[model samples]
Target: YDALSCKLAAISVGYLPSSGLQRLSVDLSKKYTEWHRSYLITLKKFSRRAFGKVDKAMRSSFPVMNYGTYLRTVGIDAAILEFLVANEKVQVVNLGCGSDLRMLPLLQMFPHLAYVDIDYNESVELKNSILRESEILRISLGLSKEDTAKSPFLIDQGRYKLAACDLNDITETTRLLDVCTKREIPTIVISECLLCYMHNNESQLLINTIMSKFSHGLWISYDPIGGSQPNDRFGAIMQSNLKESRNLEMPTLMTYNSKEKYASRWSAAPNVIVNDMWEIFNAQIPESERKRLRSLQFLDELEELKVMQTHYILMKAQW
Candidate 1:
């Protein structure tokens, strides 16, 4: 599940530049594209059938997906940048950050930033393998020759920590994070479609634990909502399709289906802000930029895109 999700995100991000969309951080996006290629190479060697599965998945892509991908990628970056600019020293903890190359751009831009990537063991292992084989990634991360020779979780000195931990195991995950994260600096905890996979109780516990562990923190998350009303066909179809197609369970999708209900989960935070992706696309994106995006792909189904985007949301809560 983690591997497939990583590939799905990687494919969308990799398509931005190829599809003629101007990425905000061009160099980092190029590296991300290269990372996808390297991961493909690793996958090919690991399993012939898995590589074929990814190839099959790529054939079904559409322009709307590319736009949503671009929005999500930029939206999260916007949140991170806003926080980093407001404070001098801070930490970014990317929960379930599967195959994410965010550290490349962010670490270079913010010298006072401490970045941590935590995911399932398998996900982190795949990423470690890709980093080992790609010298371009090594140079971007400012890794020395000897650094590549040894494969330890910590890299780029202690500034970037990549470790493996399951989110469901709240006690162990919190304990391990305590060792990597600083208690004094403000922390940004990112949940990019991660919490939805866990049982409701476990997800809430993880959120509660992380919020209390840090001295000051901001929680940013993106997830699908099943719609507040019982007659919501879109939400029902989404829930049914995910379950039948991928055998994935989104425990809180129906319960936390509205902005208000979604915000209720972060009880630890004093200030909460949530916006559906459709709202973000309309309100946050500038007119000129939206024009450029529309020109990149001829989206025949504007209503489809609108409904799809509204179901997924971007949320930020600060304590």
Candidate 2:
């Protein structure tokens, strides 16, 4: 499941100790995954062996996977920070948010802004259950014991809200969104590895709804694009592998298969920037940070990493 990303990413950042680079993000991410795994176990939803297998794979995970995970985490963070610093009274909605710890750290940085993390009903319940039990998490949001107890599926603490809605169902999704979001204020809608899971029209409908509902907003999306060239088999192989191994469907993998195709989704935005992970790492990532990351592990397959990273994209649109 995509929720596995939390553990994989945490393990990746585990190499980067609390010295200087992204200290808050790294520390908080580590803590969140620790708590998330504990809760998943305590809830009797997953067996020890299930995570034991992941641990084995994590041990065998290549440096490139680690590097890729780190890139996605901080790349999105950089984009979010870019928008947060310029605006006032902004709200961030993280769609399909699976075990992501960004909410706490971001809230700590910009205490005045509102933040919401949305996901499936089951995922929200599981996450809220963790929040209900975690005193540190509750206190950080200034929530009382009663506050966490009151909301079973939804946790609303004024500035921060955790909501659940089926993203595939537009009517229900929009209805549920209206309860959690404000239309007038500037919003930052983040879809990290979310759109590829949906049908082209389904993802498009959700995008259209959000863009129209909010008066002014920024859309930051990251996804894997099927390469455009006829000879390219990266996406086809990826799709086949995922279908056969994980049974996970990436419906729009080929539909928006290039930087141009991916960025064109937000055609109305006056300012839009789209770059693959390769470009993001080379150009957007700071030299000092890149040096720190390179020191974490010795990657032997630089060309392989570049080829794989080029298949993924980071897109930002502001109007």
Please name the candidate that would achieve the greatest lDDT relative to the true structure.
2
1-319, model 2: which lDDT tens digit per residue?
3445434544555643222333355566566555545544543433465456555666677777877776787778788887888886788989998766677767877866889888998888766766655666666666665534343236888678888888988988788678777899899999999998899888988888888878888999999999998889988999999999888889878888899999998887888899999998898777887777777778888999899899989999887
**RMSD value for candidate 2:** 3.1
For each candidate, what TM-score against the reference?
0.87, 0.87
Runs off by more than 4 Å, candidate 1: 1-47, 143-157
Please list all clashing residue pairs in model 1, or write none if there are none.
Answer: none
Clashes of 2: 0
**Candidate 2, superposed: residue stretches over 4 Å from native:** 1-50, 143-153
Mark the 10 consecutive residues where model 1 has the least summed lDDT.
15-24
lDDT of 2 at 88: 66
Residue-by-residue lDDT tens digits, candidate 1, 17-133: 322222336665566566556667666665677778776766665767766776777677788888888976999999998877778767877889999888888878766666655
Candidate lDDT scores, in order, read 0.75, 0.76
Cand. 2 Cα-lDDT: 0.76
Residue 114 shift from truth in candidate 1, angstroms:
0.9
